[PDB]
């Protein structure tokens, strides 16, 4: 198992294009890749450093928090109520994601 | 003068650049141009909307924090304490940032 806290890069990816209902998901040192839209083609995936990718979801799933204090070092979201932290903003939500659909450990598969 | 707290698209994102310090920032229906980096070309800037554009912004700035209770609604912004709300994250972000660099009000020139 792998504590989801220590969870980062493409395996992070990995794991929120599987709570997230992506259709073959996989996940290489170059990135992560799944098919989004049913009927789709493999896209570049990457919720937790890509603004694009994961902006959307930080604004559709049912966030009601993020804080850092003082402005400065890490972040803690908060989902409808389940809990974690990172270093970024979409680092500790993608991870908060993660928790909630799979608790504080994530199965070891080879992502490819 | 304007509202901030009613500010919004291309409008929001031209006083962003220009609390950004970007060179010859313009808005139009068509969006917000500016030059972020000196020696540059004008690019599309909607950090209002897009991620890519008000990701980083939000991970650089000291925000402090953001709520949104029951995870649907409002967002509020908090950053180093000068705050605003929004219906979205980067919205009342992009808000709360105009505000401290000018207050509750801003200049009505036309922005082209």
Chains 1, 2 share one sequence.
Not at 57 to 71: K, S
């Amino acid at each position: 198992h792998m504590q989801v806290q220590d969870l980062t890069g493409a395996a992070l990816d990995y794991w929120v294009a599987t709570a997230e209902g992506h259709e073959v998901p996989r996940a290489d040192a170059s990135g992560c890749t799944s098919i989004r839209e049913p009927g789709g083609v493999p896209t570049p995936f990457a919720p937790s450093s890509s603004w694009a990718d994961g902006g959307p979801i930080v604004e559709r799933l049912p966030f009601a928090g993020f804080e850092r204090d003082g402005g400065r070092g890490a972040w803690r979201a908060v989902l409808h109520t389940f809990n974690q932290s990172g270093p970024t903003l979409l680092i500790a939500a993608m991870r908060t994601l993660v928790a909630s659909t799979f608790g504080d450990d994530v199965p070891d598969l080879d992502m490819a």
